[PDB]
């Protein structure tokens, strides 16, 4: 198991600025045509997202490269995935991703999505396969290379599949999905929405709010996650690997303050990221997207102190040696208090 | 079984119950506390072992099979199971052990059936002299009475570990009455007001709405997914209009900005005014009521719309 062959790549990631992406409903409250200010975890506007490459697109005779390895995830990340075809069943959320620790499992299984929060023994390369078995005349979806042992069964989940096909126009949309993985107070939340992509690889400047899907009462301390993939084998369509290709993006969340517009029917039409530039701070204090001419006081700024010092006087002394460097000690009935 | 809704009140009128033995939880208030996890174990015990099998007991059985934490938060069920473990011939398959070294710890699975000696010589794996067996079989006989009969016992023991709690029961329910001043409880939202039928649009993941300054306005009914408005029950000051205590003792009362239907009777732009009769004349103002309407006393108290000159 766990076919281990990369041995060639150490390329640095591509860095881009996500124009206006990563806006959510940090509540379940309807709001009329209102402007609201929230202080929760958000992606800063125009941040350097590490553009990772999925299974590569290098067509000579098959031979698609796999250069999307293990990743760290501090507090919250985005998974903006094009995925013209199904390539990711889920992710490897967890703490250490080995035995004795519960690996948070999300798998497509697109009849009923299962979440199995139990101890597992995943290896570096869990992968898929969908082909015949000479019986039942179909392309069954065995997932045996994903996990070896399912131990200490504790949690279950059965519901509709997250991902679906909605293009209907010979592609050219890719049905972009973006996801958020927050775990605070042990509650795991996911946000998603279907969006089209007109560029070949890059992200547009459109604005879209991503509604919540699931609240999970898991309750596990979080250190690091990992990404999953799907490499079904190959057959006489020119060993057997390298099927599928897409493009991925991974960012990082930060505690930021947002001013979110609301339509007459709850859709967040626009938002502004405070603490980027003076103009954004001016809007955030006034709570307005249109600011008239004038001079406005936004905030204070102090000169933070540099390295601290402490000063104390001289004459840091008595001869304690005269107590211990005595040549001989006295009898145990003549204890001395050399004050 | 976890992350669902539990019920205990129905368990009072389900079968023939014998003795209510509860530790750490009042039996009349079983629907208050939230625990982390549920370990549902329901099995069969002996008759006199409702007391003879219990936490903190010595002798043969309770010391060495399992130990449960003496800090229970729950109840111990006791039924009569003379038709379960007593069969003619004997259900001697199970094991009432005699003695072991020491006790256990709560919520441990220590099941080993090792043979315990009485002396010190080693049997070398062969049963014989001085190799006394601490295992003894269950003794069940239909002829034997309470001293050996079985009793259905379900122990619902809950841990006091430090973890989030998820499993509790709800506080349902009542019906709905609209367009009336009532105090409502909607999914943990406690308030009072007038419930009516709305025409707004919630997104299909929200519970309740608010316009500005945390003033909740609409709450979706979680039975029919209908959006219900919230309007606060009407109020307002009460004013007493008097022509002087020596002129007369007759007064008229004004309710500040309150509709008449929610209290002669007359409706002004400044509230509802009772006790004063509206006239079509227009005189110089005497007692200003508001919004261009004044009142005076000329053998009854009457209301105008003041004239400028």
């Amino acid at each position, epitope marked *: 198991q766990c076919v281990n062959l990369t041995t060639r790549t150490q390329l640095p990631p591509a860095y881009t600025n996500s124009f206006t992406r990563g806006v959510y409903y940090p509540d379940k409250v309807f709001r009329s045509s209102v402007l609201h200010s929230t202080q929760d975890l958000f992606l800063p506007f125009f941040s350097n997202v590490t553009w990772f490459h999925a299974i590569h697109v290098s067509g000579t005779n098959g031979t698609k490269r796999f250069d999307n390895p293990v990743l760290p995830f501090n507090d919250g990340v985005y998974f903006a995935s094009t995925e013209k075809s199904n390539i990711i069943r889920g992710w490897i959320f967890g703490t250490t991703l080995d035995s004795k620790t519960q690996s948070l499992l999300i798998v497509n299984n697109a009849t009923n999505v299962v979440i199995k929060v139990c101890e597992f023994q995943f290896c570096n390369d869990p992968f898929l396969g969908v082909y015949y078995h000479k019986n039942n005349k179909s392309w069954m979806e065995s997932e045996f290379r994903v996990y070896s042992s399912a131990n200490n069964c504790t949690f279950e989940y059965v519901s509709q599949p997250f991902l679906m096909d909605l293009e209907g126009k010979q592609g050219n949309f890719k049905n972009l999905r973006e996801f958020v993985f927050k775990n605070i107070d042990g509650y795991f939340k996911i946000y998603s929405k279907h969006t089209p992509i007109n560029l070949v690889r890059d992200l547009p400047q459109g604005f879209s709010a991503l509604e919540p899907l699931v609240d999970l009462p898991i309750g596990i301390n979080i250190t690091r996650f990992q990404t999953l993939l799907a490499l079904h084998r190959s057959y006489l369509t020119p060993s057997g690997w390298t099927a599928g290709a897409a493009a991925y993006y991974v960012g990082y969340l930060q505690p930021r303050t947002f001013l979110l517009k609301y339509n007459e029917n709850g859709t967040i039409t626009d938002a502004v990221d405070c603490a980027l530039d003076p103009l954004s701070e001016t809007k955030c204090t006034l709570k307005s997207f249109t600011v008239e001419k004038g001079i406005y006081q936004t905030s204070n700024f102090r000169v933070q102190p540099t390295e601290s010092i402490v000063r104390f006087p001289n004459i840091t002394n008595c001869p304690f040696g005269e107590v211990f460097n005595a040549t001989r000690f006295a009898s145990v009935y003549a204890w001395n208090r050399k004050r | 079984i976890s992350n669902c809704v539990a019920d205990y009140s129905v368990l009072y009128n389900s079968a023939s119950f014998s003795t209510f033995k509860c530790y750490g939880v009042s039996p009349t208030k079983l629907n208050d506390l939230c625990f982390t996890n549920v370990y549902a174990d329901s099995f069969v015990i002996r008759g006199d072992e409702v007391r003879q099998i219990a936490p903190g007991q010595t002798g043969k059985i309770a010391d060495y099979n399992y130990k449960l934490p003496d800090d229970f938060t729950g109840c111990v069920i006791a039924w009569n199971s003379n038709n379960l473990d007593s069969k003619v011939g004997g259900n001697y398959n199970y*094991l009432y052990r005699l003695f072991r070294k020491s006790n256990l710890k709560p919520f441990e699975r220590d099941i080993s059936t090792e043979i315990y000696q009485a002396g010190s010589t080693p049997c070398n*794996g062969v049963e014989g002299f001085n190799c006394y067996f601490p295992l003894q079989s269950y003794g069940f006989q239909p002829t034997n009475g309470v001293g050996y009969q079985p009793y259905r016992v379900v122990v619902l023991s809950f841990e006091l570990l430090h973890a989030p709690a998820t499993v509790c029961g709800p506080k349902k329910s009542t019906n709905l009455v609209k367009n009336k001043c009532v105090n409502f409880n909607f999914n943990g939202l406690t308030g009072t007001g007038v419930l009516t039928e709305s025409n707004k649009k919630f997104l299909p993941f929200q519970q309740f709405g608010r316009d500005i300054a945390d003033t909740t306005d609409a709450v979706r009914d979680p039975q029919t997914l209908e959006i219900l408005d919230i309007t606060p029950c009407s109020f307002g000051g009460v004013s007493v209009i008097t022509p002087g205590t020596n002129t007369s003792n007759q007064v008229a009362v004004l309710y500040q900005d309150v509709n008449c239907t929610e209290v002669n009777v007359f409706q002004t732009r400044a509230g509802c005014l009772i006790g004063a009769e509206h006239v079509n004349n227009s005189y110089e103002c005497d007692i200003p009521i508001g919004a261009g309407i004044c009142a005076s006393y000329q053998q009854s108290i009457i209301a105008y719309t003041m004239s400028l000159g």
Partner: nanobody
Amino acid sequence: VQLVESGGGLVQPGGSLRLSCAASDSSFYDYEMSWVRQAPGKAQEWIGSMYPSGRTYINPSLKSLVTISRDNSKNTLYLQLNSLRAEDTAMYYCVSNWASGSTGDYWGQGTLVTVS
């Protein structure tokens, strides 16, 4: 809990039953598992044993009653038994490294298979 025993129960004389023992990993199989019982008076004779690489050897004189199979998806164990008799009057155990004594192993739950 490394090893958990699945299935089993009281057996009527002249009946049959199937056992199970979910395994934590294929690595703990090294190099002899155990479908151990406590027969009355009869010595401790191993019945079910197997190897991490997927081998199987059974005692020649006691293999007319016991069959073994596995699946690697759930790491569940199959002990399909036929014609149960009175020589099983105890509760079983499926414990790894049983042959190395009774102190270098983890004890799970076990199952009872007895007849009159």
